[PDB]
């Protein structure tokens, strides 16, 4: 539970940010 | 759960750590993961562990339950410390085969377990299959970002499979990079007298190497100064200055290993043709022109042979030029550039000296006699 | 989710600037 | 006290990047812009480095650094001009300064104003004014006032680049 | 007042240098840039940096200036060691002679009345034979 | 060993020169002293980020007499093939100095004034040869 | 508060241990967010930049506002090598000084989770440069405590000198992730 809850967090903020980071480049 | 008991119980159960079992499992309990790792190596290093299944037990306990997270490397490098003290060389692979799987992230670490299959494989025999481990992993390892403690090892494997092998040149180069990549004041004086005895042999019995210098030169081959053998020393200083004189002198000596008396034949061409080139780099461009006569006073062949002495050297391409022997005469107009001694580059020096001073002389005299035309 | 958005979006970002580049790329005769 | 034509360079210092290394926290750098006895006290050593920042390039032509009169004062001031970044009390005792007055009691009083070269200050965006020493030896040291006076440079302050003629569609 | 005919626009080595690289970097289509510098007092403009635009369809005309651009590299050439203004802009012609032709004066007249004081800068770089500039 | 090369202004400097002219990728870096320093393998690993195949060119702006004013020099890492300890240093690169025409035609101007005529006056070669 | 910070990682292979569930990776990765965001939640137009002190020191990120780039650089941050604090700390007031905007008040948070393989006599010179040159460093101490927590306690006094509330040394016992002391710190509390 606890691993996988970390992995939700690190996946959710940093993929979110490279995400918005990058549209924002290419936009 | 069972590795704190396994630890309370080699307390005192198993042999060594004493008082160090106890801070071993503290280390555990507190779950540093770590440190442990440290002291598990200088352990595992102890005058204790040679011929112990404790060792393979405590493998099974607490690696097991334990290396799921640790430097990959450093779990590779207990591994081997584990692996070295299970003979099952049929197993052995299989295990290896395992670690490898283990750890899959450190391109250090499986570069690490490939070279102890390789040599655990080539121990066993499999010649067939220990080359192509090798030689996989020189293409994997040349590829990491520059050098790092597994290089030792793989080059140490590379220099055992070309021993056994016989490849005595390949068996030299790898030697030497492996003793590069390695401190030597790590290694103790009995491993950096063997291995400088082999690098030497390699050398002397060699298709090719005809650059001795580097290992003169080398702290390794200081520790045979006042060893029971100079004389390999002694030797390899003849070769590096073709010194045929000095080589019957030895000979002697170079008798007792076997393998030399084997290979005279190629010794004494290997030493012959270090003599010519030796008087060709010598010898000036004035007069490089080198008599027949002058290379049978040099390295001992009567002048019918001494065509052949030449024809050789310059094939192998160590010295290029030509032979007219009408007159007996041979032009050397080049030599294999090598590596010298501070007396030489002192020599060289002194020649740069007078070169200059011709150089600057003439400097003047046109600056003197131009004065009215250089704009 | 990530490995095909992040290689799609590396296609086409990577597009997009080649494009930039050759949008300063002069034609010969 | 201020030549015609000449102003006092208040208004164009813009907080945004007036700092003062070295500053105790009792007395802060606002002290020294009042005219008043509020003043600015050194924290560890008989050093002190101000930096003050100007919206657009102005030429200093004097300046008006003083301090009290019971030995705490200024006593060798090194002005550099235009620094990319801010520096340290190391690069500020071996840097050739712009300027290297010496000051002496007479600039400290009130009626005190130091000339500057003009020339080498003839567009100044950033100052950095360490003093070394004190006007005696005390381990602490004060600034009572300081302030510029010189002129503005013109400036071409982009971002107003705006069409002043012509439609908004031609090329060439 | 008035501008003497004294008037020099002393072109530093650098700007000669990057004037005609992006002119011959980018004929027969038209480049543009600015051109920092410092008004030295009424005789003298020095222009010691030039400073690329990049190419954006509408030509050279006020359009092309691309306010983020222009504001960003001169707050980084500060940060670098460049606090220069901004002395006029320059703008090639490929081939077709050194001139202004009705969008230059547009543009030369925003300068101006940014600060009455920019240069605009013209060159011909195909015009530019080795040994005439 | 404490120095701060700032790879945020690096990164958002190259995107502009990238929008003025894309036919040009960071090749490594300069540095205008005269000598190597200690920081310099740090620096160039920072930059290998940027360029795998980076050059250091130690411009030097103080005007010798006798030799081109820029050395280059890459980086290698390698087992030493004689046995000596490896560590992390630079290699030679051959540099030269050459130029575009559209620079030439500026360099030109610029030297008119000083200039060497382009011919051989025997005086001139006679120069050459001291 | 205008104030620029400088958050130091320590990414030594001393953070390999699971002290801190579930490694002291993930407790200095949350740490780090958790400062990051509090930061960002005082004034917004504060920064904060990061800093990694391996074998030597590197820089990550130069002072952005924008914390998300500093959490996605700091993912990445894996366990190499030993720590130097020294060199970490004047390299992080170097980025200090190529601060755009020059009011924001110098701050470092370096986490010192290794043992700092250094001298006292350096250390507390170090703490008189900083002294002078206006930089409050704030450590959070976890780890080899009775190894360094001296060095540590010597340098933060010597920050503070008689009355310096700047530099604040918060030394987290071993429990549960390295977060719940830092919500609730001096260092943080203020903010
Ligand atoms: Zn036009």
């Not at chain 2, 003849?238 to 008798?255: I, P, Y």
């Not at chain 5, 410092?38 to 940096?49: G, L, P, S």
């Not at chain 7, 998300?68 to 020294?86: A, Y």
């Amino acid at each position: 539970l606890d691993s996988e809850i970390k992995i939700m967090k690190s996946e959710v903020l940093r993929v979110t940010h490279e995400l918005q980071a990058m549209k924002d480049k290419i936009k | 759960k069972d590795v704190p008991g396994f630890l309370q119980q080699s307390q005192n159960s198993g042999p060594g750590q004493p008082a160090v079992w106890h801070r071993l499992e503290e280390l555990y309990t507190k779950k540093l993961w770590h440190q442990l790792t440290l002291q598990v190596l200088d352990f595992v290093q102890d005058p204790c562990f040679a011929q112990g299944d404790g060792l393979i037990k405590l493998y099974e306990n607490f690696i097991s339950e334990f290396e799921h997270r640790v430097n990959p490397l450093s779990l590779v490098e207990i591994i081997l410390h584990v692996v070295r003290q299970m003979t099952d060389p049929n197993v052995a692979l299989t295990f290896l085969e395992k670690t490898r799987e283990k750890v899959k992230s450190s391109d250090e670490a499986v570069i690490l377990c490939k070279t102890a299959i390789g040599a655990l494989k080539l121990n066993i025999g499999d010649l067939q299959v220990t080359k192509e481990t090798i030689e996989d992993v020189e293409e994997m390892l040349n590829n990491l970002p520059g050098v790092t403690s597994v290089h030792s090892r793989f080059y140490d494997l590379s220099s055992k499979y070309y021993q056994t092998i016989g490849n005595h040149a390949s068996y030299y180069k790898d030697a030497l990079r492996f003793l590069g990549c390695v401190d030597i004041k790590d290694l103790p004086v009995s491993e950096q007298q063997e291995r400088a005895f082999t690098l030497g042999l390699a050398g002397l019995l060699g298709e090719g190497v005809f650059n001795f210098g580097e290992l003169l030169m080398h702290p390794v081959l200081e520790s045979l100064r006042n060893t029971d053998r100079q004389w390999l020393i002694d030797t390899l200083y003849a070769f590096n200055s073709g010194n045929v004189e000095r080589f019957q002198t030895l000979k002697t000596a170079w008798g007792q290993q076997p393998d030399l008396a084997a290979n005279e034949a190629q010794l004494l061409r290997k030493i012959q043709l270090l003599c010519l080139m030796e008087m060709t780099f010598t010898r000036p461009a004035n007069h490089r022109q080198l008599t027949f006569e002058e290379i049978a006073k040099s390295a001992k062949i009567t002048v019918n042979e001494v065509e052949l002495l030449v024809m050789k050297a310059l094939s192998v391409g160590l010295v290029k030029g030509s032979i007219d022997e009408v007159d007996k005469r041979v032009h050397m107009t080049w030599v294999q550039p090598r590596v010298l001694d501070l007396q030489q580059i002192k020599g060289m020096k002194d020649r740069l000296e007078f070169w200059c001073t011709d150089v600057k002389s003439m400097e003047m005299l046109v600056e003197h006699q131009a004065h009215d035309i250089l704009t | 989710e990530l490995r095909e958005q992040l290689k799609e979006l590396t296609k086409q970002y990577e597009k997009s600037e080649n494009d930039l580049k050759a949008l300063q790329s002069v034609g010969q005769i | 006290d201020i030549p015609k034509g000449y102003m006092d360079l208040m208004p164009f210092i813009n907080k945004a990047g007036c700092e003062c290394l070295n500053e105790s926290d009792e007395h802060g750098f606002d002290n020294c812009l009042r005219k008043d006895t509020t003043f600015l006290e050194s924290d560890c050593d008989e050093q002190l480095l101000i930096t003050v920042a100007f919206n657009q390039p102005v030429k200093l032509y004097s300046m008006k650094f003083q301090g009290p009169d019971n030995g705490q004062g200024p006593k060798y001031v090194k002005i550099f001009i235009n620094l990319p970044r801010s520096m340290d009390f190391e690069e500020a005792e071996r840097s050739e300064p712009t300027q290297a007055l010496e000051l002496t009691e007479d600039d400290i009083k009130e009626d005190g104003i130091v000339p500057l070269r003009y020339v080498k200050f003839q567009n100044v965006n950033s100052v950095t004014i360490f003093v070394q020493s004190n006007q005696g030896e005390e381990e602490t040291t004060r600034i009572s006032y300081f302030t510029f006076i010189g002129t503005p440079v013109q400036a071409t302050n982009m971002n107003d680049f705006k069409r002043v003629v012509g439609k908004k569609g031609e090329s060439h | 007042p008035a501008v003497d005919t004294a008037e020099q626009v002393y072109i530093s080595s650098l700007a000669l240098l990057k004037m005609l690289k992006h002119g011959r970097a980018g004929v027969p289509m038209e480049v543009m840039g600015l051109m920092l510098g410092e008004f030295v007092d009424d005789y003298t403009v020095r222009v010691i940096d030039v400073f690329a635009m990049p190419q954006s369809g509408t030509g050279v005309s006020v359009e092309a200036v691309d306010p983020v651009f222009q504001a960003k590299m001169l707050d980084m050439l500060k940060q670098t060691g460049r606090p220069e203004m901004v002395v006029g802009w320059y703008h090639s012609h490929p081939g077709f002679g050194c001139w202004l032709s009705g969008v230059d004066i547009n543009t030369q007249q925003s300068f101006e009345a940014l600060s009455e004081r920019a240069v605009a800068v013209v060159v011909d770089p195909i015009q530019s034979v080795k040994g005439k500039v | 060993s404490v120095w701060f090369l700032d790879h945020d202004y690096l990164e958002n400097m190259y995107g502009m020169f990238k929008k003025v002219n894309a036919r040009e990728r960071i090749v490594g870096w300069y540095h205008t002293g005269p000598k190597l320093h200690k920081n310099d393998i740090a620096i160039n690993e920072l930059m290998k980020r940027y360029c795998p195949n980076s050059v250091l060119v130690i411009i030097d702006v103080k005007p010798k007499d006798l030799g081109l004013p820029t050395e280059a020099y890459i980086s290698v890492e390698e087992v030493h093939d004689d046995g000596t300890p490896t560590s992390k240093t630079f290699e030679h690169v051959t540099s030269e100095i050459g130029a575009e025409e559209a620079e030439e035609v500026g360099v030109e101007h610029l030297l008119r004034d000083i200039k060497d005529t382009t011919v051989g006056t025997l005086s001139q070669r006679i120069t050459n040869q001291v | 508060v205008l104030e620029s910070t400088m958050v130091c990682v320590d990414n030594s292979e001393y953070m390999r241990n699971g002290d801190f569930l579930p490694t002291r990776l993930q407790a200095q990765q949350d740490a780090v967010n958790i400062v990051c965001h509090s930061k960002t939640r005082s004034n917004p137009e504060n920064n904060v930049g990061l800093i990694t002190l391996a074998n030597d020191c590197e820089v990550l990120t130069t002072l952005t506002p924008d914390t998300g780039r500093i959490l996605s650089k700091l993912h990445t941050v894996q366990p190499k090598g030993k720590i130097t604090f020294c060199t970490g700390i004047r390299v992080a007031h170097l980025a200090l000084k190529h601060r755009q905007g020059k009011n924001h008040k110098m701050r470092i948070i370096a986490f010192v989770g290794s043992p700092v393989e250094d001298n006292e006599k350096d250390l507390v010179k170090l703490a008189k440069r900083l002294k002078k040159e206006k930089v409050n460093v704030d450590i959070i101490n976890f780890g080899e405590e009775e190894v360094n927590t001296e060095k540590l306690t010597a340098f933060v006094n010597t920050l503070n000198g008689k009355d310096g509330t700047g530099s604040h040394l918060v030394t987290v016992p071993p429990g549960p992730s390295l977060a719940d002391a830092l919500i609730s710190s001096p260092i943080l509390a203020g903010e």
